[PDB]
Design a protein around this ligand. Structure first.
Ligand SMILES: CC(=O)N[C@@H]1[C@@H](O)[C@H](O[C@@H]2O[C@H](CO)[C@@H](O[C@@H]3O[C@H](CO)[C@@H](O)[C@H](O)[C@H]3NC(C)=O)[C@H](O)[C@H]2NC(C)=O)[C@@H](CO)O[C@H]1O
Ligand code: NA
Length: 129
């Protein structure tokens, strides 16, 4: 599923991401936009052999198990395929865990390089929230 911008904002808010750890909803919509282009099925191989999965490109080296990432931890205790569902609940639960692990949203490279310090409020403009 490729989410619309406001559709994803409403889902992220419903799953409790707005201001989770102080990150406004726009931060999460922006991060999902540049990580996956709002595509829940997005997957990307990393050079270290891990893979990034779903709307928030959660990495298999640390957060999920994909059975092909040597040295991986599975701190969200979930199959990486479960991060590709059209229902983003699992991605949100794992993102809540990730953003609380110490480096906040800097865990998302696209957020750090493209959203951090920007007018992230632009990402929720017009959404019924
Ligand atoms: C969205 C996503 O998957 N992003 C990936 C990043 O999570 C990942 O960076 C590494 O993340 C782990 C977990 O947050 C970092 O480990 C934590 O480090 C902090 C101190 O910095 C400490 O409080 C924690 O104990 C420790 N947690 C664990 C479980 O060990 C780790 O430092 C990050 N590594 C780097 C190089 O930034 C990167 C790299 O795998 O990939 C992103 O896609
Ligand atoms: Na794994």
């Amino acid at each position: 599923k490729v989410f619309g911008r406001c559709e994803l904002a409403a889902a992220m808010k419903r799953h409790g991401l707005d201001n989770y750890r102080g990150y406004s909803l726009g931060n999460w919509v922006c991060a999902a936009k540049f990580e996956s282009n709002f595509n829940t099925q997005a997957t990307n191989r990393n050079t270290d052999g891990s893979t990034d999965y779903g709307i928030l490109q959660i990495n298999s080296r640390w957060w999920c198990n994909d059975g092909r990432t040597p040295g991986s931890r599975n701190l969200c205790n979930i199959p990486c395929s479960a991060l590709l569902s059209s229902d983003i609940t699992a991605s949100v639960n794992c993102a809540k865990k990730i953003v609380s692990d110490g480096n906040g949203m800097n865990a998302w490279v696209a957020w750090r390089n493209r959203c951090k310090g920007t007018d992230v409020q632009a990402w929720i403009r017009g959404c019924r929230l």
